[PDB]
């Protein structure tokens, strides 16, 4: 019976909550209060990347830690050289509503998508001197929010409908379909070992999936509103999310619980991007109030503030070698901090 | 200073910048509009007529271009999206105006349309954005009111005490009852609109049919008093 199934689900959820409560004996703050604080951090802008016509929604780093890719609502993708502020490529798109981009780990392809429900893959290294579409992937019903590369032939996408999918590039057909969400999915992050990934949805819940088997492993429910950002700890055993309730949270997979919450009484606006440092000591978060904060990931205090944008901050990223961070906003400017 | 191979990467960047400047010049001369409404409302006929007169399985957005008096206009509508709207409406916070088409011959789904209009009008990201609302399907309203098969007072009790405003100007000249009914519907929408306007954006009402050829002119006029208002604000005059 449906009522019997609902009662069984409620009882099992109560059992899971009881197990989670039992497994907790100490808090992270209590353990970490005997550690010297990092202190004030002074990050200064080094370069400014101008040239975009409209607001910036997405940005991703390259593996070489020197190249950049950014997406704007005017319908263009620009590849930057961060050291010299030169423009290497300028790819015009068929659809002007793009809100995701990604660089392949090899450096040969890029991806983009948005309100057109299509994930487009571009080829950068051809005998001809131009950049051309390699394949357009179709099959999603709603808008696409995120996309990440596993290798040169596999991609992962999250869409407006409650569904994430894993694709093949040689043949455009899907391979696995991840279902179980209730609202729109807006964030996606792969593990360092490229065997698991996490997704944040509008139902105030986060899930972890396995690529090979294709089933949901664990679920996390601590937030009170939509989740807009997600990221992985470098270890691969924790992840941090940002939401519209002006709070950040840190979870752990082995314990399956929540460790700390990063909140302040002055901040009212919600977060839009979350990114870790190379060692995991600092968490960088963008906010709707035109400023980006820097938090200590172990003691939950505001280490520093970055304020250089005249509009809301949309994207944020940290390079592989940890020498710089990049921030894009709705003022159509990209900034490299150090 | 710089090596040879590197003073040939600057030239390429300069060429890219020139192309970007040309694209910016083209971009600044186009006005973008978003078409929004229910499935019952006949926005599809409106867009088909606009495409015919002037100027792919699960695609989520459609684009239509039309030109009037040597100015360009882009119109977008959402085809494959879900029922939720609070997420992708953020991308349309810089459009010139939003066109809201509502059917006027239903008497049963009018409250849903009014609730949708309040959701749109009070959106946080949709402030300082004007709305042009089209009250489509006037012929059906006139025929239904004349026939008298179904009444309107049952759905809206306050219709009995309502009276025709003195500013009503029926251009063709028809029966008073249909005029009273349509002006009552317009007054409901206008009360909703000006409840909390705050002076940052306006609402332009119109009575129209799907086959009418003068829709482009109405859109052009509304976009001109919206651009004029923004230029008034920007150039330190008010």
């Amino acid at each position, epitope marked *: 019976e449906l009522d019997q199934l609902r009662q069984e689900a409620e009882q099992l959820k109560n059992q899971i909550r009881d197990a989670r409560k039992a497994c907790a004996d100490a808090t992270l703050s209590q353990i970490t209060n005997n550690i010297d604080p990092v202190g004030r951090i002074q990050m200064r802008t080094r370069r400014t990347l101008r040239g975009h016509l409209a607001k910036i929604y997405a940005m991703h780093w390259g593996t070489d830690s*020197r*190249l950049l890719v950014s997406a704007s609502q005017d319908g263009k993708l620009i590849i930057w*050289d961060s050291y010299t502020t*030169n423009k*290497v490529h300028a790819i015009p798109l068929r659809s002007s509503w793009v809100m995701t981009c990604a660089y392949a780990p090899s450096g040969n392809y890029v991806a983009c998508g948005g309100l057109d429900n299509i994930c487009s893959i571009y080829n950068l290294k051809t*005998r*001809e*001197g*131009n950049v051309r579409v390699s394949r357009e992937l179709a099959g999603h019903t709603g808008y696409l929010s995120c996309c990440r590369f596993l290798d040169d032939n596999q991609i992962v996408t999250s869409s407006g409908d409650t569904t994430c999918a894993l694709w093949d590039i040689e043949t455009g057909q899907q391979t696995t379909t991840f279902t179980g969400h209730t609202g729109d999915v807006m964030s996606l992050s792969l593990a360092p070992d490229t065997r698991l990934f996490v997704s944040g949805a509008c139902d105030a819940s986060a899930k972890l999936w396995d690529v090979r088997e294709g089933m949901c492993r664990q679920t996390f429910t601590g937030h009170e509103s939509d989740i807009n950002a997600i990221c992985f700890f470098p270890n691969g055993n924790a992840f941090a999310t940002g939401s519209d309730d002006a709070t950040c949270r840190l979870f752990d997979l082995r314990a399956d619980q929540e460790l700390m919450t990063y909140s302040h009484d002055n901040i009212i606006c919600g977060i839009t991007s979350v990114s870790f440092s190379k060692s995991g000591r600092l968490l960088l978060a963008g906010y709707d109030d035109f400023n980006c904060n820097v938090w200590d990931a172990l003691k939950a205090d505001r280490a520093g503030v970055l304020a250089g944008h005249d509009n809301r901050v949309s994207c944020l990223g940290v390079t592989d070698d940890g020498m710089a961070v990049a921030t894009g906003s709705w003022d159509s400017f990209l900034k490299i901090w150090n | 200073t710089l*090596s*040879a*191979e*590197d003073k*040939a*990467a600057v*030239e*390429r960047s300069k*060429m890219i910048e020139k192309q970007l400047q040309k694209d910016k010049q083209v971009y600044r001369a186009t006005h973008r509009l978003l078409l929004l409404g229910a499935d019952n409302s006949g926005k599809s006929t409106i867009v088909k007529q606009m495409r015919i007169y002037h100027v792919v399985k699960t695609s989520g957005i459609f684009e239509t271009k039309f030109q009037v008096d040597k100015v360009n206009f882009h119109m977008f509508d959402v085809g494959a999206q879900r029922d939720e709207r609070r997420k992708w409406i953020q991308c349309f916070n810089d459009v010139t105006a939003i066109i809201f088409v509502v059917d006027s011959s239903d008497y049963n789904r009018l409250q849903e349309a009014l609730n949708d209009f309040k959701s749109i009008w009070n959106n946080r990201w949709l402030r300082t954005i004007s709305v042009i609302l089209f009250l489509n399907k006037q012929d059906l309203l006139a025929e239904k009111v004349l026939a008298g098969k179904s009444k309107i007072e049952d759905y809206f009790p306050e219709f009995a005490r309502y009276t025709t405003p003195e500013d009503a100007t029926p251009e063709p000249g028809e029966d008073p009852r249909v005029t009273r009914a349509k002006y009552f519907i317009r007054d409901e929408f206008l009360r909703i609109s000006t409840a909390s306007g705050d002076g940052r954006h306006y609402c332009y009402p119109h009575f129209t049919c799907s086959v009418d050829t003068e829709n482009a002119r109405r859109i052009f006029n509304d976009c001109r008093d919206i651009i004029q208002r923004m230029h008034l604000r920007q150039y330190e005059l008010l």
Partner: single-chain antibody
Amino acid sequence: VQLVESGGGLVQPGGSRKLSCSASGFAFSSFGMHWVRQAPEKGLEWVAYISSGSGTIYYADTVKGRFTISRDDPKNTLFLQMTSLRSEDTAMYYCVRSIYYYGSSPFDFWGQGTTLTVSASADIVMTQATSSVPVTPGESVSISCRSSKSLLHSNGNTYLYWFLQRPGQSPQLLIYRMSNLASGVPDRFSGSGSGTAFTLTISRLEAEDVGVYYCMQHLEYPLTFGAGTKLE
């Protein structure tokens, strides 16, 4: 991709000619073009260079006033106008494309070449070793190179290039910037250097590896090539 060129023949001294390079199969407007000439029994020497957008034009010290280079993107072809042809201009001229951005590989493709017969400063000098070196199927070679001035720059790039010319068609690129293998070349080839001394190594010789190996510098114009070594 392909590059077909024509316009060569016997010319009396004091005449003029117009060489053309017809391009088809790639985006011409985004590429730079060079003219390289080779004497009937000697090495290569750089002639001129046009840039994308025709912003920078360079000439060699020998043909600075006589020669003129031009392009026209819509017709997708390249011209080189020569005046006052002396007896030292007898050579086979080539048409080579080059692109320049972070990570690009210039001098990737070479044309067929056209023949031309005429009836009778402080530039970096690169020195090659003895022309010949007798070899056998199955063993390794250690072609060497030398330079007058160090080719390392503040950026960290060493601008040295390697070319192979079979007894047949035009030369093909092997190594660019002293460490990178070009697309289409096997993994046997490898290059190394130390700023003024450079070398090229082939791990296992084959039947198609015979020919003449050349070098280049791209630190500053004009580009000097070197004599070259032959493997028999």
